[PDB]
Amino acid sequence: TNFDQEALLYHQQGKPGKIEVISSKPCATEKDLSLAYSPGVAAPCKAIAKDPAKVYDYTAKGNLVAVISNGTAVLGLGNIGPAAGKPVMEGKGILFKQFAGIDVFDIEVAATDVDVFCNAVRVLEPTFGGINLEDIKAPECFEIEERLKKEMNIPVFHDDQHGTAIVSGAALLNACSITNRKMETVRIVVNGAGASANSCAKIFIALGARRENIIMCDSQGVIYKGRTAGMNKYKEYFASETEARTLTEALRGADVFVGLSVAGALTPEMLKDMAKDPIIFAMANPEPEITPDKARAARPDAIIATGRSDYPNQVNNVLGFPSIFRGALDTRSTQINEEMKLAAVHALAKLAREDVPDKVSATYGGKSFKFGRDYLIPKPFDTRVLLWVAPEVAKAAMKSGVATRAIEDWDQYRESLEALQGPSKVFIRSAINRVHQNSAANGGELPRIVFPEGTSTKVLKALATLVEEKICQPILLGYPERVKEKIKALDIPLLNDVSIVHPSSHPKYFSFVEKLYSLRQRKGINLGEAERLMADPNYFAAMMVNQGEADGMVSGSSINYADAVRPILQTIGVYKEGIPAGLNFVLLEDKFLVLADTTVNLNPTAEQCAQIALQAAKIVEYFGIEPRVAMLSYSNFSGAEGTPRKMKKAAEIARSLRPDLMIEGDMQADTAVNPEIMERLFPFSGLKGGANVLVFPNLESSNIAYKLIQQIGKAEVIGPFLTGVRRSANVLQRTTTVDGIVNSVVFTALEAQYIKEVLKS
Amino acid sequence: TNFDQEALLYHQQGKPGKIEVISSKPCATEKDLSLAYSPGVAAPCKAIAKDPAKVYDYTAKGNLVAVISNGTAVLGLGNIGPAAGKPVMEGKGILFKQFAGIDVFDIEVAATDVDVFCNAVRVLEPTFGGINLEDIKAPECFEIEERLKKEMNIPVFHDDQHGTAIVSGAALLNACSITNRKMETVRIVVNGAGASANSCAKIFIALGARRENIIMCDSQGVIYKGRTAGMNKYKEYFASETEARTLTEALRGADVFVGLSVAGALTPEMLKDMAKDPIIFAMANPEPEITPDKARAARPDAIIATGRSDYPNQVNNVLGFPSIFRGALDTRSTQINEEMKLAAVHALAKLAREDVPDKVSATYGGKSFKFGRDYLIPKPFDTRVLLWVAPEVAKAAMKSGVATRAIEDWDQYRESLEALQGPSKVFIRSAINRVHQNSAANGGELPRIVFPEGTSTKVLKALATLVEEKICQPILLGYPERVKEKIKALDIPLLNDVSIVHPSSHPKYFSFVEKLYSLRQRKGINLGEAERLMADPNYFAAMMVNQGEADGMVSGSSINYADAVRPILQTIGVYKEGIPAGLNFVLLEDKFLVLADTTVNLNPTAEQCAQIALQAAKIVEYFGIEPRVAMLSYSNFSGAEGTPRKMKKAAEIARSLRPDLMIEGDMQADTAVNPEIMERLFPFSGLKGGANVLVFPNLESSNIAYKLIQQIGKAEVIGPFLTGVRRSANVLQRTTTVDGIVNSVVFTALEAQYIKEVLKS
């Protein structure tokens, strides 16, 4: 197949393999290496000698999980060797890292004797914080893990053994709550005796199922006690008292079919004879025991789940292990025990019922999902999985006493969990915590924010995520029923209760058209034009804000930047000495840089540049950071006629206005951001410690700079945001994504709170 | 100590540990993971099943080396455990990666029985391409490696056993060539019986030393045959027929002292009694058997070497293992054998004699080094090490038959080796190969290039590296003896034979001042001013170029950009329709982007922007790449009055001039570089596949853009370079580093060849 060859080149091209190792600390100099190695590395070693625990503080143990296998059960290809099994392992590690931020070593072992293999593995224990076995044959595997969990004082976990059980377990919980079943009256039939089969029962049972109501099958029919044909010590756990000997006889009147075998194993004939509301987990690969459509054909009352990505309810293990190993690892647990595996099932099934975020609908091509028969388990790609599962896993490991380190700030824990991908995401979270902070100080009151484009798909979808973060109270504009149509159209019930206002219909409408009239009658407006402009949701919004009928507004999700910025300016205006200006954030590992003005003024004058900068400094001072400002130029201090003079004189004005602040010009870009270049070449410069605020000499330089950093800099950039207006106001771009719309709203809310506080004085 | 605590926070802060694992292939989408894992990963596995060899083609084996230890000998702290020994290992891996680009897993093993440990290690063989043991006690270690090298069909190597031997071995070779000794008449005394001692002899001997002339000591004196006090099976290798029982009796008349013990072990008394020209390797840590100054005190004829970084001849293993494992790994060798270890000693000692590059002098604070008594071995930080050692290691492994894959293009091999750090470095190497390519087609003739600032430290030092790459024939300007003074002052004898010209003294001087006269008498020059301006090296250079007395020039390593660009323009001029323009390269993983004009024109007109671009396209077409051009703006196609109109009309002109080329405007930045944004929003745009040539609307935008990418983009940027002049000419900045000066010269040479070729037509 072309797909086969595409896989081959994926692995082969460029750097062969799928993994690489890098340093987590600087490693450039005589000094850097004199820290990471001799003579420096002695200091941690000695400290680990005196207290072994500290091995987690100075080393990578705390995040290092080994994926180990002998390649005696790779995927569905079986015992194909340790060599051929390696890529699958590299990949399993990739999954670890991408889904829970966990670093992983692939270890391919050449021993098929249970004892060689264990004697080899157990002695790796100081290396890893946790051990993930994968793709090892039955029944050897059971002997190996059962032994190892006992042997080693770190967690040991065979993913193929327990994953399927945990996800299909959460799934069963849900289906059972759905169909009003009780676990203790559920009959469960397991066809198949692979790695997974044995643990499925352990778990359903652990969730409350009666083992008498559980029948288990293999390639030779029902497993009845005393059957000797093809048994091992481990299958012997779940033999039934039943007289049924064929699968079919077992599935007669059965409530749930746990299908762990091959396709076609489940006939429409057996389906006709299962209980009312049959729960069917057909997880055979690549093809299920029966297709969902063929099953809905025999019994429309059937609930169906597979491991395939193109059918509903994809049962993929990745819902499981990453979140789990994570939670374990963070508490420095000694095991992954049953308390924990169950806590994980309970978390997955709990998360499943929450309204499906538009980020997730997005991952799967806009398809809407609601908790039900077609959504039993969170989609494998929910970014919330980790946030919901890992903390409960740690919570369990602490409650069960296998943990050696206690997590106290739960919220903090989750925060770090989000933080895992996104140096920007962390920033917006700081931001939101800081909205909540002065929110709760002024009565828990939330800033009122109007969204003129009330039928905007993107604005709505953003709002959705917005409310459960309790950022703002949303007011949309348009015809109330033509927007509730779009809320019901987007399956977004999160926000069924928000204010929806038609301009022309609102009581203060006329009071408004009069107030616009006097503000603009001598600027080209008669009494008629003000009536018709106030009918524009934008002008209606702004006027709402100016009068205090709302604390802020945001639009421009549908309109050109300009077209959307003008009514704001004509209604709200700027405060004394203000200038309208667009500002960006560039987010690095430590600091962030502020870029302006990137949307508004075409070729700003010196006075104007000094004001842009001063505002940018009030904004950075808001976050408790010392603002450092550079008026950018093509020259290093020339004062030459033209741009340099404008910028030099600009900085001079800015200092004239705020003498406590470090401000300079004119200077090139690199000369700005880098304090080393500054001290080496222009030691006279008042700017040291590198600039954190970059003012551009004109619009060409700033728009090209910000969009070029965004595309090439591979550092993350948010914005642009609007500044300098009398009231909390902000313009989006049409190209704005939903994320953009929600953080933009956050800033709007904050500045609003800041407006209220400037009022209090 | 404050240093101890600084080490602690180095390891503890941010992400605990010192290592992380990432993916080497994209991993973002349903598609990305459907390749790296199921169902895709089946395709490599099946392929490895049919031919095991292919495990190197689709997996990370080919670059994966395990550093393994039980922590029974960590540094000088001894048997402190597998746990405490981990950080030292993480660090050893860091070294692997940083010095030879080798990925490394740290494996800390809890077994002190030779047999547990080996039985555990050998079964890891499918995982790694090679095995590095480190810091394991004697004599267990000998049993373990001696066993393992036999056991496993991948290389096994205990670094502490052989490193010291290999580096101190190259070092001995040199000292022996220096003092005109022959190995077979050398007497060698080894004090100490650590890991290293045993292999030292193996190697000196393998280099030609007679074992009868070798005496070996430990904590109980000389090792004589039959002494039973404190022996093991392995010390028994090198017992001597000698009657000396104390160290002192051994060192009487000894030629070389191999000191592997503790400080003070070597008295001035014993020193008085060693042979003429005593070679002293005192490598005890942290303090040597004797300080170099205390040793030079007793015997000034003594050659001395330590493992300390602040004394000459630092013997650090890093000269050894990285280069070695590299060369092995690339040939898919089954061992690291003696043929190879020796080939490595021969490479290190050969490299030691090459003139010391200014990059290396730079690493150590400008100190100059020449092969001699104070430089026996390349400095640990020579970037050449790898380039010289690894290919010879592979060469040996192929000649000795332990290899399973043959390297043919040796040059290519080295090229890739350089390439290892530097996506820009690879580019300049392409460039140089391409200078050599049309050089060898026009008679091996090299472009003549004049360097007016002939006393420039940086220009000289650059030239040094330049010649051995045979790029150009350098002509310097200044007073001949005042520059040969600076060549002798910089210990840079590489270039003792280059043309050195005083302007005023040269025969064509007057012919020149006359030709300047008529070119500029009606532009403010009398006959006198031309005499005195031609006395300026710059004008002298340019005039040399204009007349064909040289093929090109470069300066501005000392002068302001402008001040240095003016004489060029006044003498050489531009060709028909030319515009003077500064251009940069941005280097990514695949493509590169071209930025202009970043130094010259302040606010270029439309006609001018179209010409800047056209030139930039001749330049990108030169490298066989399809040029894609965007006239950058703050707008997406507004044609609005102002910048957008200028740029839109600009592109329109550029197409009017070269209709085969993909050129567009006006457009924002991101809209340019990203073909996806282009197809989604402006599908009408003639520009698809993302822009690779970015023309700026003015100087503010371009200087701020390029210097901002350089500082934040963390993609690499070279330049600025000069374009559009009639002849090969180029201006440096004062801030230019030596690297900058040498690649700048390369381009100058090339354009010169391109000038010659345009002439041929």
Q: How far apart are CA B592 and CA B715, in angstroms?
A: 10
Is B539 catalytic? The answer is: no
Q: How far apart are CA A570 and CA A562, in angstroms?
A: 12
- Sequence-separated (6 or more) residues with CB below 8 Å from residue B472: B446, B447, B448, B449, B466, B745, B748, B749
Q: How far apart are CA B451 and CA B557, in angstroms?
A: 10
Q: Catalytic one among A86, A92, A202, A395?
A: A92
Q: Is the Cα dihedral B404, B409, B415, B419 positive or negative?
A: negative
- Sequence-separated (6 or more) residues with CB below 8 Å from residue A745: A449, A462, A463, A466, A471, A472, A554, A730
Which positions in chain B touch A9 (Cβ < 8 Å)? none
Shortest CA gap B83–chain A (Å): 5
Tokens of A649: 């004189």
Q: How far apart are CA B368 and CA B631, in angstroms?
A: 48
Shortest CA distance to A84 belongs to which of A96, A72, A68? Answer: A72
Supply the angle between the helices B321-330 and B338-352 in degrees, to the nearest 10: 120
| C-beta neighbour count of B146 within 10 angstroms | 15
Side-by-side strand order, sheet with A130-133: A103-108, A64-69, A130-133, A156-158
Question: B553 touching A, CB under 8 A?
Answer: no
Q: B216-225, long-range: CB within 8 Å, 24+ apart, which pairs?
A: B216/B189, B216/B190, B216/B240, B217/B189, B217/B190, B217/B191, B217/B192, B217/B193, B217/B247, B217/B250, B218/B191, B218/B192, B218/B193, B219/B193, B221/B245, B221/B246, B221/B247, B222/B246, B222/B247, B222/B249, B222/B250, B223/B193
Q: How far apart are CA A331 and CA A461, in angstroms?
A: 36
Contact B720, B699 (CB under 8 A): no
Write out the E strands in B436-579.
448-451, 473-477, 499-501, 552-555
Q: How far apart are CA A106 and CA B369, in angstroms?
A: 45
Best mutation target among B11, B128, B734 (most A Cβ atoms within 10 Å) is: B11
Q: How far apart are CA A674 and CA B49, in angstroms?
A: 54
- Sequence-separated (6 or more) residues with CB below 8 Å from residue B445: B439
Q: How far apart are CA A172 and CA B559, in angstroms?
A: 77
- Sequence-separated (6 or more) residues with CB below 8 Å from residue B708: A669, A670, A673, A705, A708, A709
Q: How far apart are CA B756 and CA A342, in angstroms?
A: 78
Contact B40, A11 (CB under 8 A): no
Q: How far apart are CA B416 and CA B429, in angstroms?
A: 10
Check CB contact under 8 Å for B119 and A124.
no
Shortest CA distance to B203 belongs to which of B67, B340, B376? Answer: B340
Contact B329, A16 (CB under 8 A): no
Nearest-Cα residue of chain A relative to residue B108:
A127
Beta strand A592-596 pairing with A581-587 = antiparallel
Q: How far apart are CA A437 and CA B742, in angstroms?
A: 56
Residue B189 phi/psi, 5-degree rounding, is -110, 120
Q: Which helix (H) or strand (E) holds B189?
A: strand B188-191
Q: Is B496 annotated as a binding residue?
A: no
CA B131 to chain centre: 25
Contact B420, B322 (CB under 8 A): no
Nearest-Cα residue of chain A relative to residue B714:
A713
Experimental resolution (Å): 3.7
- Sequence-separated (6 or more) residues with CB below 8 Å from residue B293: none
Question: B673 touching A, CB under 8 A?
Answer: yes
CA B640 to chain centre: 50
Q: Is A135 annotated as a binding residue?
A: yes
Give Cα separations from B761 to B85, B577, B718, B754, B756 (angstroms).
69, 19, 31, 11, 9
Q: Is B209 helix (H, G, I), strand (E, B) or coil?
A: coil
Shortest CA distance to A416 belongs to which of B27, B17, B28, B15? Answer: B15
Please, what is the Cα angle at A181 between A177 and A187, to 5 degrees?
Answer: 125
Residue that has been written with the tokens 């030596």 in this structure? B738
In SS3 terms, A464-525 reads as HHHHCCCCCEEEEECCHHHHHHHHHHCCCHHHCCCEEECCCCCCCHHHHHHHHHHHHHHHCC
Tokens of A197: 């089969």
Residue B221, sorted as left (phi over 0), alpha (psi -120 to 50) or beta, turns out to be left
Contact B533, B709 (CB under 8 A): no
Could you say which of B43, B586, B681 has the minimum Cβ distance to residue A8?
A: B43
Residue that has been written with the tokens 């080919």 in this structure? B62
Q: Which helix (H) or strand (E) holds B133?
A: strand B130-133
Q: Which helix (H) or strand (E) holds B305?
A: strand B303-305
Question: A39 touching B, CB under 8 A?
Answer: yes
Side-by-side strand order, sheet with B103-108: B103-108, B64-69, B130-133, B156-158
Which positions in chain B touch A36 (Cβ < 8 Å)? 10-11, 18, 91, 94
Q: How far apart are CA A747 and CA A719, in angstroms?
A: 10
Q: How far apart are CA A542 and CA A536, in angstroms?
A: 10
Question: A116 touching B, CB under 8 A?
Answer: yes
Residue that has been written with the tokens 């027929």 in this structure? B241
Shortest CA distance to B710 belongs to which of B618, B607, B529, B587? Answer: B587
- Sequence-separated (6 or more) residues with CB below 8 Å from residue A459: A451, A453, A476, A557, A741
Please, what is the Cα angle at A176 between A172 and A177, to 5 degrees?
Answer: 120
Preceding amide of B493 cis, omega within 30? no
Q: Catalytic one among A10, A31, A37, A237?
A: A37
Q: Which amino acid is at A203?
A: I
Q: Is B571 annotated as a binding residue?
A: no
Q: Is A599 annotated as a binding residue?
A: yes
Check CB contact under 8 Å for B593 and A712.
yes
Tokens of B117: 């440990």
Side-by-side strand order, sheet with A256-259: A221-222, A214-218, A188-191, A256-259, A279-282, A303-305
Residue that has been written with the tokens 């100059």 in this structure? B368
Strand partners, A240: A224
Check CB contact under 8 Å for B123 and A127.
no
Which positions in chain A touch B18 (Cβ < 8 Å)? 23-25, 36, 59-60
**End-to-end CA, chain A:** 72
Residue B711 phi/psi, 5-degree rounding, is -85, -30
Q: Over the Cα atoms of chain B, what is R_g? A: 31
Q: Which amino acid is at B212?
A: E
Q: Is B290 helix (H, G, I), strand (E, B) or coil?
A: coil
Shortest CA distance to B591 belongs to which of B487, B482, B690, B722? Answer: B690
With b meaning 16 or more CB within 10 Å and e meaning fewer, what string describes B367-397?
Answer: eebebebebbbbbbbbbbbbbbbbbbbbbbb
- Sequence-separated (6 or more) residues with CB below 8 Å from residue B595: B583, B584, B585, B586, B694, B696, B702, B705, B706, B709, B719
Contact A17, B24 (CB under 8 A): yes
Count the alpha carbons within 13 Å of A252 in the hemisphere toward its beta carbon: 9
Nearest-Cα residue of chain A relative to residue B120:
A120
Q: Is A174 annotated as a binding residue?
A: no
DSSP-assigned letter for residue A377: S
Contact A231, A164 (CB under 8 A): no
A459: CATH: 3.40.50.10950
Q: Is A160 annotated as a binding residue?
A: yes
Could you say which of B109, B285, B286 has the minimum Cβ distance to residue A123?
A: B109
- Cα-Cα-Cα-Cα torsion B78, B84, B86, B90, nearest 10 degrees, comes to -90
Q: How far apart are CA A387 and CA A407, in angstroms?
A: 14
Number of inter-chain CB pairs under 8 A, A vs B:
447
Q: Is residue A466 classed exposed, middle or buried when 0-12, 13-18 and 19+ CB atoms within 10 A define those classes?
A: buried
CA A650 to chain centre: 42
Residue B163 phi/psi, 5-degree rounding, is -65, -60
Which positions in chain A touch B83 (Cβ < 8 Å)? 48, 52, 55, 126
Strand partners, B552: B449, B728
Shortest CA distance to A14 belongs to which of B414, B416, B407? Answer: B416
Beta strand B279-282 pairing with B303-305 = parallel
Residue B248 phi/psi, 5-degree rounding, is -60, -45
Please, what is the Cα angle at B631 between B629 and B634, to 5 degrees?
Answer: 140
CA A330 to chain centre: 19
Q: How far apart are CA A341 and CA A23, in angstroms?
A: 33
Q: How was this structure determined?
A: X-ray
Q: How far apart are CA A461 and CA A743, in angstroms?
A: 13
Side-by-side strand order, sheet with B279-282: B221-222, B214-218, B188-191, B256-259, B279-282, B303-305
DSSP-assigned letter for residue A235: G
Give Cα separations from A356 to A166, A371, A376, A386, A490 (angstroms).
21, 8, 12, 15, 11
Q: Is A189 annotated as a binding residue?
A: no
Q: How far apart are CA A710 and CA A713, in angstroms?
A: 6
- Sequence-separated (6 or more) residues with CB below 8 Å from residue B757: B438
DSSP string, B433-469: HHHHHHHTTTTS---EEEES-TT-HHHHHHHHHHHTT
Helix, strand, coil: what percent of chain B each, to 5?
A: 45, 15, 40
CA B328 to chain centre: 20
Which positions in chain A touch B697 (Cβ < 8 Å)? 700
Tokens of A710: 């965004």
Contact A103, B20 (CB under 8 A): yes
With b meaning 16 or more CB within 10 Å and e meaning fewer, what string describes B409-444?
Answer: eeeebbbebbeeeeebbebbbebbebbeeebeeeee
Q: How far apart are CA A33 and CA B95, in angstroms?
A: 9
Check CB contact under 8 Å for B25 and A11.
yes
Shortest CA distance to B335 belongs to which of B393, B400, B402? Answer: B402
Residue that has been written with the tokens 């060369």 in this structure? B327
Tokens of B232: 């093991």
Is A92 catalytic? The answer is: yes
Q: How far apart are CA B760 and CA B554, in angstroms?
A: 24
Contact B332, B112 (CB under 8 A): no
DSSP-assigned letter for residue B275: P
Which positions in chain A touch B710 (Cβ < 8 Å)? 670
Q: How far apart are CA A728 and CA A553, in angstroms?
A: 7
Shortest CA distance to B380 belongs to which of B472, B326, B426, B315? Answer: B315
Write out the E strands in A114-260.
130-133, 156-158, 188-191, 214-218, 221-222, 256-259
Residues preceding chain discontinuities in chain A with C to N over 2.5 Å = none
- Based on DSSP, count helices (H) and strands (E) in chain A, helices before strands: 30, 22
Nearest-Cα residue of chain A relative to residue B631:
A704
Contact B100, B323 (CB under 8 A): yes
Nearest-Cα residue of chain A relative to residue B641:
A602
Residue B583, sorted as left (phi over 0), alpha (psi -120 to 50) or beta, turns out to be beta
Question: A555 touching B, CB under 8 A?
Answer: no
Nearest-Cα residue of chain B relative to residue A680:
B735
Q: How far apart are CA A480 and CA A477, in angstroms?
A: 8
Which positions in chain B touch A698 (Cβ < 8 Å)? 698, 700-701
Q: Is B429 helix (H, G, I), strand (E, B) or coil?
A: helix
- Sequence-separated (6 or more) residues with CB below 8 Å from residue A523: none
Residue that has been written with the tokens 């206690």 in this structure? A406
Tokens of B105: 């897993």
Check CB contact under 8 Å for B126 and A108.
yes
Strand partners, B141: none
Q: Catalytic one among B86, B92, B149, B379?
A: B92
Domain interval for residue A535: 426-571
Shortest CA gap A79–chain B (Å): 10
Please, what is the Cα angle at A363 between A587 and A281, to 5 degrees?
Answer: 135
DSSP string, A269-322: HHHHTSPSS-EEEE--SSS-SS-HHHHHHH-TT-EEEBS-TTSSSB--GGGTHH
Residues making up chain A, counted from first to last: 761
